[PDB]
Amino acid sequence: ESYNPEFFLYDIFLKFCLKYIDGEICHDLFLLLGKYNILPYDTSNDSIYACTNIKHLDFINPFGVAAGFDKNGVCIDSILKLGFSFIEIGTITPRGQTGNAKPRIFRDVESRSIINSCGFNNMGCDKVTENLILFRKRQEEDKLLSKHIVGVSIGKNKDTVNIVDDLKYCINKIGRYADYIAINVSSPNTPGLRDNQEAGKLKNIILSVKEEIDNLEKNNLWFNTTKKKPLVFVKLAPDLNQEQKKEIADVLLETNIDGMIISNTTTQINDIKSFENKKGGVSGAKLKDISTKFICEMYNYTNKQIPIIASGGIFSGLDALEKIEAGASVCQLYSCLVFNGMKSAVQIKRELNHLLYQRGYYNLKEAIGRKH
Ligand SMILES: Cc1cc2nc3c(=O)[nH]c(=O)nc-3n(C[C@H](O)[C@H](O)[C@H](O)COP(=O)(O)O)c2cc1C
Ligand SMILES: Cc1c(C(=O)NC2CC2)nn(C)c1Cc1ccc(C(F)(F)F)nc1
Ligand SMILES: O=c1cc(C(O)O)[nH]c(=O)[nH]1
């Protein structure tokens, strides 16, 4: 009963943390609990009707943890054992960074919103690779983790001129241990990063990343879950106009990107009194509708040819079903872990299974894109 993530004390501690403790400190405490493997766990098998896939990536269930939660890969086992099918570590950069000055994370509990200006704080590609190699060694000896997927989000150091150099550096160090690589061109907290979403720049970035991944073999294998070379995803920002979204879509089709993560934080949420005039991008429930509309738009601009990982405002099974019906094959959570806590995975999985049964869906795959 105690290791059950729905134990009552966890909600007691969650409420106390959300009322009296700084956001980053709460996060650091969660990571500390996982580092010592004293977090609750849920090793129950998941419904075979709720599993999903992106190409050859077979997700035991449709819920993972978004990037920026385990930036340095120091907590992969514990987070996954909460009930998640995958996690995206990072975003990492070649050299470590401490990020912007603190406090840089703020919460609004009433609206279930977060705002952050972290600035790609992380231990750097080389250290984080060592943490991921340790996990992959543990995974090779634990059967309960053999189907779990780990992706790596890569970006650039603040002072780097040509992003492709930094992306290549990361791919050549951590790529062989990744099940997929997420190209982060959508953080609002690294000056000029979002400009790389322009079509011509993005195209060259994607081809450069894919060419570097395809060269890992020759340069001398796959110490990951798929035992295959990592897929390539792009994470997009929701603060784009329609012509930019159409131009990106055309590039994603030409370059054969394996999927698109929709979406990162936004600067369009400005009705939160306590966040006014603050730096950073907003996450949480207020982002849900904005990011779901973005899924529908890109699902149609890419003619349904590009799989979608949903990110933004997902708290309930209904929220997740809305993303799936809009076009998503899998969902990523972040703010749900902040405001619901340890029970996030267990609870949302049960809710979705109930909804699939209620709505007359045979399985989750049948629901993908049904809104359209
Ligand atoms: C504190 C914090 C740090 C984040 N860091 C990253 C990051 O490093 N890379 C990334 O791609 N997204 C990052 N994100 C964005 C989340 O991955 C996610 O896309 C966003 O929070 C929307 O999901 P949500 O509304 O369910 O929280 C971060 C978000 C927060 C709140
Ligand atoms: C809140 C919170 C946060 C958080 O505010 N992140 C920064 C705003 C972005 N991140 N997470 C995992 C939680 C849930 C949590 C933390 C600690 C504990 C406890 F058991 F250790 F007390 N329980 C639940
Ligand atoms: O992709 C990202 C990165 C950050 C950050 O490190 O500041 N923050 C976000 O909201 N999204």
Domains of the chain: 4-372 (3.20.20.70)
173 close to 129: Cβ distance less than 8 angstroms: yes
* E-only strand ranges, 55-203: 57-59, 63-65, 86-92, 105-108, 113-116, 149-154, 180-184
Which own/partner pairs from 46-50 qualify as long-range (CB within 8 Å, at least 24 positions apart)? Answer: 46/83, 46/85, 46/349, 47/349, 47/353, 48/363, 49/353, 49/356, 49/362, 49/363, 49/364, 50/349, 50/352, 50/353, 50/356, 50/363, 50/364
Q: To 5 degrees, how large is the angle CA 181–CA 186–CA 190?
A: 105
> What distance in Å separates the CA atoms of residue 281 and residue 263, rounded to the nearest whole number?
12
Q: Is 235 in the pocket of ligand 1 (CB under 6 A)?
A: yes
Paired residues of 233 in beta bridges: 182, 259
186 a catalytic residue? no
Terminal Cα-to-Cα distance of the chain (whole angstroms): 43
Which of 98, 128, 189, 194 to mutate for ligand 3's pocket (most ligand atoms within 8 Å of CB)? 189
Report how far apart, in Å, the C-alpha atoms of 24 and of each of 18, 217, 235 are.
11, 39, 23
> What distance in Å separates the CA atoms of residue 209 and residue 194, rounded to the nearest whole number?
17
Which of 9, 26, 79 to mutate for ligand 2's pocket (most ligand atoms within 8 Å of CB)? 26
Which of 12, 18, 25, 338 to mutate for ligand 2's pocket (most ligand atoms within 8 Å of CB)? 338
Residue of 328, 302, 206 whose CA lies nearest to 245 = 302
> What distance in Å separates the CA atoms of residue 207 and residue 182, rounded to the nearest whole number?
14
Report how far apart, in Å, the C-alpha atoms of 353 and of each of 3, 91, 154, 349 are.
23, 31, 33, 6
Which ligand does the CA of 190 lie closest to? 3
Q: Is 283 annotated as belonging to a binding site? A: yes
Residue nearest to atom 24 of ligand 1 (CA): 312
Q: Is 313 in the pocket of ligand 1 (CB under 6 A)?
A: yes
314 close to 320: Cβ distance less than 8 angstroms: yes
* Active-site residue, selected from the candidate residues 111, 153, 187, 344: 187
Report how far apart, in Å, the C-alpha atoms of 234 and of each of 56, 130, 202, 310 are.
17, 24, 9, 12
211 close to 176: Cβ distance less than 8 angstroms: no
Shortest-distance atom of ligand 2 to CA 342: 24
Q: What does the block give as tokens for 1?
A: 């009963």
Q: Is 338 in the pocket of ligand 2 (CB under 6 A)?
A: yes
Q: Is 233 annotated as belonging to a binding site? A: no
Beta pairing class for 113-116 and 281-284: antiparallel
Torsion of CA 320, 324, 328, 330, to 10 degrees: 50
Q: Is 2 annotated as belonging to a binding site? A: no
| Residue 162 neighbours by CB under 8 Å, 6+ apart | none
Which ligand does the CA of 5 lie closest to? 2
Which ligand does the CA of 34 lie closest to? 2
